[PDB]
């Protein structure tokens, strides 16, 4: 176990004898993580990395049908809640009955708006985040009924009610603008086969405009590089096929740099702590840069592993991101929720499945039962659900009005 290896210990933090809030907080975590690492060699037990599939399943199974008033703060993100669980169950390779699916379908419906978008709950003004999650969740189903629901026409009408003239997109009528909208709109419009020759004009150009002095990408120009935004930017550029818009080599070095040398997991921004969800947002950037670089014809590109430490990330998620009661989480000590669960698993998967055409190298760590279903790097949904998705809606027309 790379993480339990003795040399690893020398991977701790060197605060160069100068103490600050940054180093300090990092010290707290580096030591916290240690404890769980040596937990084994402490109780005198053989390290065995398993994924409590069963405990995550019950935590979710029901969560997908009812939650406590602790999830009230997400009363406006229920569609999000669906995607997170749904994808999770999907990732754990679980079944979504013909019952429940229909129940979901019917829910997203009322969530949808007669204006074309998807609110964050029944009868709520449309928003691009819930719309993104809604679509995604409806594509994880596949069933005709699912694919339907989505009023493609009004969808474009909506996406249009948000396009801006400098390229960027509005989060929602009256809301704000940050890369997230670009990808959100790009993920749905593409999956629904509703993209027009103009729909996304100037976007690739504005998205790239977000790539800052530190290889990464910020929410808005001039904004610090962030993992959630960089993914949204790069992923959006992929959907648009303008990868070549950013300094791919500079972003790579930035992202690769986001993996913690000791913890093993990824950090969202340089000099911040580790966080399970970034195991997808950050780590998930590598499968994309890979396709782009290769797309460019790079021959010094691997053919078995992603340009990031799969082993170590996989350990971290397993060792310190699993709730013993079920659900994954930020880092040890924190509490469980479905967002982190969904992205912790998502990161796990990404970290154990490789491809490059005929290439396909898997690196499941610990128990072989910890191997999960594959996830698409762009849409973050089964590579098949996305195949079904497109090919289907594809058989329909592009709402040229």
């Amino acid at each position: 176990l790379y993480s339990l290896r003795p040399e690893h210990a020398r991977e701790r933090l060197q605060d160069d004898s100068v103490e600050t809030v940054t180093s300090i907080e990092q010290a707290k975590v580096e030591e916290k993580i240690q404890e769980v690492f040596s937990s084994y060699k402490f109780n005198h037990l053989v390290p065995r990395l398993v994924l409590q599939r069963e405990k995550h399943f019950h935590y979710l199974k029901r969560g997908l049908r009812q939650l406590t008033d602790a999830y009230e703060c997400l009363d406006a993100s229920r569609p999000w809640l669906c995607y997170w669980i749904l994808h999770s169950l999907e990732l754990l390779d679980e079944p979504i009955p013909q019952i429940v699916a229909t129940d979901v379908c019917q829910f997203l419906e009322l969530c949808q708006s007669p204006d074309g978008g998807f609110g964050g709950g029944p009868g709520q003004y449309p928003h691009l985040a819930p719309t993104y999650a809604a679509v995604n969740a409806l594509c994880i189903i596949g069933t005709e009924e699912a694919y339907n629901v989505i009023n493609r026409e009004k969808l474009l009408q909506y996406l249009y009610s948000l396009k801006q003239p400098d390229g960027s997109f509005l989060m929602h009528v009256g809301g704000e603008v940050d890369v997230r909208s670009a990808y959100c709109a790009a993920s749905v419009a593409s999956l629904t086969n509703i993209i027009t020759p103009d729909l996304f004009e100037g976007t690739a150009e504005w998205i790239a405009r977000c790539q800052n002095w530190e290889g990464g990408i910020g929410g808005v120009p001039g904004m610090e590089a962030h993992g959630g935004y960089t993914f949204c930017g790069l992923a959006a550029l992929v959907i648009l096929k303008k990868e070549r818009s950013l300094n791919l080599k500079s972003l790579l070095q930035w992202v690769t740099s986001r993996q913690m040398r000791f913890e093993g997991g990824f950090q969202g921004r340089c000099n911040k702590l580790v966080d399970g969800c970034y195991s997808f947002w950050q780590a998930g950037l590598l499968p994309l840069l890979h396709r782009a670089l290769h797309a460019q014809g790079d021959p010094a590109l691997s053919m078995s592993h992603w340009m990031f430490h799969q082993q170590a990330l996989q350990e971290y998620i397993l060792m310190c991101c699993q709730c013993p009661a079920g659900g994954l989480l930020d880092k040890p000590g924190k509490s469980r929720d479905f967002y982190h669960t969904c992205y912790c698993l998502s990161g796990l998967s990404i970290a154990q499945h490789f491809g490059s055409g005929a290439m396909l190298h898997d690196v499941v760590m610990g128990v072989p039962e910890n191997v999960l279903q594959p996830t698409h790097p762009v849409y973050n949904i089964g590579p098949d659900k996305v195949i079904q998705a497109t090919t289907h809606f594809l058989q329909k027309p592009v709402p040229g009005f």
Partner: protein, 312 residues
């Protein structure tokens, strides 16, 4: 009116003023998915807001209703909007609203709506007189609040409040040089005001940085930043630097330094130099001391580098 967290506070369904109104329940459906078990208070304030929203009652009892429905979920956009609509139609005092947002943001400075609301009011009142300082209040509770630095950028760009920013980033940097937000705000000011093309300033930042880079040799911030500027033009345009760094190998070393050196050998090779075999030798060397022992976590990266130079 009645504070939502006051011991006295009473459910709407028990309030007189709200006797003519019939609160409309949520419509989850026959088979509810991800249904939330709302508490009484929460489910009260919203089933009612539903009504007000429903009959677009641009009332005052409603404007108050949104302060609550917002406290129960300040991340509910549909509601922040109706409020905006009520502030206008109701012709409400935007300074009062300034005070409200100011406070409520102190309670949750990691929320998207609370901040977007702030911007709007400032765009309405076309007055940032109190921005750069309330934002410092927040950045004093959390120097890395993504929203706070975002609002701060806007405030500065829109009303051109540059000037004293470096005198701000310079403050916080001394406050904790490991802060990457301030290092970003630093590149922000300069690049947008005096720019970096100006040899002096650059020459200046370069030093300043280097000191940090040699004051806390393990701060990846000063490192990513130093390469941050010299990087555009070519890390290979500046001969000196290299040795000036090599001159730290023993003294102040870290994967950052060595990686910098590898970064340089990568430009010192792009613009067809002399000693290919010495760069394309001492450079592949490093990717190895890095990928094999020094910076092994990104082993597949480093090995990739040395594998790239080979072809190209």
């Amino acid at each position: 009116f009645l504070s939502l967290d006051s011991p006295t506070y009473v459910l709407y369904r028990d309030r007189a003023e709200w006797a003519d109104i019939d609160p409309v329940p949520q419509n989850d459906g026959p088979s509810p998915v991800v249904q939330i078990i709302y508490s009484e208070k929460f489910r009260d304030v919203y089933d009612y807001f539903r009504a007000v929203l429903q009959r677009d009652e641009r009332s005052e009892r409603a404007f108050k209703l949104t302060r609550d429905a917002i406290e129960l979920n300040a991340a509910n956009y549909t509601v922040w909007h109706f409020r905006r609509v009520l502030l206008r139609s109701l012709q409400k005092d935007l300074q009062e609203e300034m005070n409200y947002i100011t406070a409520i943001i102190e309670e949750q400075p990691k929320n998207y709506q609370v901040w977007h609301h702030r911007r709007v009011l400032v765009e309405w009142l076309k007055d940032p007189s109190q921005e750069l300082e309330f934002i410092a209040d927040i950045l004093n509770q959390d120097a890395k609040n993504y929203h706070a630095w975002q609002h701060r950028q806007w405030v500065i760009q829109e009303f051109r409040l540059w000037d004293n920013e470096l005198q701000y980033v310079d403050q916080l940097l001394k406050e904790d040089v490991r802060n990457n937000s301030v290092w970003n705000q630093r590149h922000f000011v300069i690049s947008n005001t005096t720019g970096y093309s100006d040899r002096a300033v650059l020459e200046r930042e370069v030093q300043y940085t280097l000191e940090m880079i040699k004051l806390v040799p393990h701060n990846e911030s000063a490192w990513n930043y130093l390469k941050g500027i010299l990087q555009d033009r070519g890390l290979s345009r500046y001969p000196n630097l290299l040795n000036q760094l090599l001159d730290l190998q023993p003294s102040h070393s870290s994967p950052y330094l060595i990686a910098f050196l590898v970064d340089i050998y990568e430009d010192m090779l792009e613009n067809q130099c002399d000693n290919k075999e010495d760069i394309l030798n001492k450079a592949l060397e490093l990717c190895e001391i890095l990928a094999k022992e020094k910076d092994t976590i990104r082993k597949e990266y480093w090995r990739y580098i040395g594998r790239s130079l080979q072809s190209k």
